[PDB]
Design a protein around this ligand. Structure first.
Ligand SMILES: *[C@@H]1O[C@H](CO)[C@@H](O[C@@H]2O[C@H](CO)[C@@H](O[C@@H]3O[C@H](CO[C@H]4O[C@H](CO)[C@@H](O)[C@H](O)[C@@H]4O)[C@@H](O)[C@H](O[C@H]4O[C@H](CO)[C@@H](O)[C@H](O)[C@@H]4O)[C@@H]3O[C@@H]3OC[C@@H](O)[C@H](O)[C@H]3O)[C@H](O)[C@H]2NC(C)=O)[C@H](O)[C@H]1NC(C)=O
Length: 244
């Protein structure tokens, strides 16, 4: 499995991990030089596994749906935990031999924030936060897990989707930070950006519908075509148009 360990964590090793995560996903080609995910795939190739290891050498394995980069489940090696409403074939295909449990929420941000009783902007990221999240999930506690899963998802799925997010985390190897509204805006608009970039291919680079983001200085900005920085040097994976 593609693996990230905290014992050797550096900015460079984290970037290498995210590159390897991206590379492990099958692609349906590129649009404006950005890889597009598959629309559908056979069950035997539907999931990839990633290992995350804390400072104390304790590992969890997260299962990711290759069609959308969603984490669907994780395992401690002996017990596994599945989100509500994951693809129906996931339990049969993943972590066979473990004791399989269901988490009391779906993996969407609305439901995770409700379960955590706090917002993404209230929850620290950075590699020390990843260490704590791994520990919380390895020693599963129902009250603490949603916040830990929010850390895990943003540090894997969202970093894979956006270079900007990857770099913010890579810049916090020994420190912690709470994500800005710039980060939150990218996460919220991944599907919308994916849709518009694929539409734009048949419209001379023009979006059908604008996407509103927050720039690093906190300004509202309107994205209307593929010449914008978010398209040319940020987004790294597109959700297939079939799923938008
Ligand atoms: C495809 O899309 C691009 C858009 O990415 C099309 O071009 C770009 O359009 C944007 C939006 O209109 C434009 O940005 C704005 O520029 C205004 C002018 O800025 C110049 O002049 C002022 C003085 O008048 C100077 O202060 C500047 O330094 C600069 O020389 C600017 O006033 C706008 O800012 C206002 O809004 C922001 C909030 O978003 C506030 O913060 C400001 O106080 C103002 O109220 C705006 O500037 C952008 O602001 C957000 C920042 O994140 C950006 O970095 C900053 O640019 C771009 O100038 C324009 N880009 C180019 C290269 O032309 C493009 O035509 C289209 N391409 C196609 C169709 O092929």
């Amino acid at each position: 499995n593609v693996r990230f360990d905290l014992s050797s964590a550096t900015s460079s090793s984290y970037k290498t991990f995210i590159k390897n995560l991206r590379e492990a996903l099958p692609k349906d080609g590129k649009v404006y030089d950005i890889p597009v995910l598959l629309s559908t795939v056979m069950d035997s190739r539907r999931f990839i596994l990633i290992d995350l290891v804390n400072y104390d050498g304790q590992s969890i394995t997260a299962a990711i749906d290759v069609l959308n980069v969603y984490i669907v489940a994780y395992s401690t090696g002996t017990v596994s935990y599945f989100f509500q409403q994951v693809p129906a074939q996931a339990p049969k295909l993943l972590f066979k031999g473990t004791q399989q449990r269901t988490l009391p929420y779906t993996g969407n941000y609305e439901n995770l924030q409700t379960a955590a009783k706090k917002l993404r902007e209230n929850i620290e990221l950075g590699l020390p936060a990843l260490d704590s999240a791994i520990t919380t999930l390895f020693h599963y506690n129902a009250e603490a897990a949603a916040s830990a899963l929010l850390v895990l998802i943003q540090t894997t799925s969202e970093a894979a989707r956006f270079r900007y997010i990857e770099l913010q985390i890579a810049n916090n190897v020994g420190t912690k930070f709470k994500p800005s509204q710039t980060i939150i805006s990218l996460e919220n608009n991944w599907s919308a950006l994916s849709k518009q970039i694929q539409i734009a291919k048949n419209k001379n680079g023009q979006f059908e519908t604008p996407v509103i983001l927050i720039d690093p200085q906190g300004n509202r900005v309107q994205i209307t075509n593929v010449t914008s920085n978010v398209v040319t040097q940020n987004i790294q994976l597109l959700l297939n148009i079939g799923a938008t």
